[PDB]
Symmetry: C2
Subunit: 247 residues, 2 copies
């Protein structure tokens, strides 16, 4: 179940999305997903087959009621969302989403909807040797209070912020190094699940650099960002993971 | 007169609980009505509510379209067909650290559009009982009344939420002199502008107090929370505020 998903982010409109969902609709035992903006979710699930998983890029761990401008897990399931994004760097950097905020939202849907826990270290963290410290911290509340049965449903979406926006390139060794380390943090709890948990890379992925990244031994797919906005591109990234996983 | 009765469905309801709400609200004169559903339910409300009833979004951002998850834009506000937008609600200011500097950048984004912004203001129990009410209220409109022209400050709605009032309820005449004060602020900008600006009241606008609160001299409309979800009590308040 090679998990290839696309973060659409706040980009697009009603027309550019319907033109894409037709283009997105175009494929062996793999897993493709899409996270559109909140206002377009019911349209997107209506323009795609259920084989494609659809989710939202953020909810709120509050129960329904006096909470303005927010969406809940119960309002998440009513739309028909299969997955859910948790802990994105931009919600963490531009809105100060803490590790406590991540675990609260995760606990809402953990026993239901496959969660997508996003993690990543900053550029100052990697240069100051805070690499392994922060990634263990961003995993503390998850691995300390949940079980193998709940851990298996969690999908880690590693996105290295030290390479996003900073322009600093990411060699395929340090990509494999971090994915190998993230898996080792789970291996400290259970290795049979750690070796069969989907840790998808959420850095800069394009159709040009598609292979040699998914081909790495510790990559279970990608959390594609800007490249996922185009069908001829996203479906090209689709077909790459399809062929390399078969042979 | 003219009343702007608006319903803010904060974080409530489902598709089957909104269809019955929309069709069930559809039963007014030259008196504007608006509805604030969730972003995951906006087009469902557009598909079930009449044209003359406004449908706005609860929260957007000020950043342009780009690498921003979990947010909604002013374009997505316009492309989705929203006629209104709620700005500066006390819950987003309390629980999610929404600042006046955020309120202004989001308001300034949509003021040049056909969308009527609904900027919300209000002080808590600490502020008014300590006399700070005049300060913590002029602060929140300070940025807005600064850079916005008298023409820009038109079609801007001031929703005053009495956050200071659980069992205790804001007194009736204790609201009129409050709505009188905030208009005397824009009276320093322009008396005429402060004479036409619609200022609604963001409190427990329940059915058994429809006329009285809306009959206060400086109450230009209403932004209801819990009773907007029950269309029977929602319709009656618009019906008891038809004139």
């Amino acid at each position: 179940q090679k998990l290839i998903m696309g973060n659409w982010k706040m980009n697009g409109n009603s027309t550019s999305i319907k033109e894409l969902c037709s283009g997105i609709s175009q494929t062996s035992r793999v897993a493709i997903a899409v996270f559109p903006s909140s206002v377009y979710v019911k349209e997107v699930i209506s323009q795609l087959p259920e084989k494609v998983g659809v989710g939202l890029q953020n909810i709120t761990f509050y129960d329904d009621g006096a909470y303005t401008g927010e969406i809940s897990a119960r309002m998440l399931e009513d739309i028909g969302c299969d997955y859910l994004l948790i802990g994105h760097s931009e919600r963490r950097s531009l809105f100060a989403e803490s590790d406590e905020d991540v675990f609260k939202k995760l606990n809402k849907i953990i026993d239901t909807i496959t969660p997508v826990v996003c993690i990543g270290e900053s550029l100052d963290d990697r240069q100051s040797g805070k690499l392994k410290q922060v990634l263990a911290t961003q995993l503390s509340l998850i691995l300390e209070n949940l079980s193998v049965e709940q851990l298996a449903k969690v999908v880690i979406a590693y996105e290295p912020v030290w390479a996003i926006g900073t322009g600093v390139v990411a060699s395929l060794e340090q990509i494999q190094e971090t994915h190998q380390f993230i898996r080792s943090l789970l291996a400290k709890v259970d290795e049979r699940l750690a070796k069969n948990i989907k840790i998808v890379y959420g850095g800069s992925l394009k159709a040009e650099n598609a292979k040699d990244i998914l081909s790495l031994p510790d990559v279970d797919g990608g959390l594609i960002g800007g490249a996922s906005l185009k069908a001829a591109e996203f479906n090209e990234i689709i077909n790459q993971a399809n062929k390399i996983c078969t042979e």
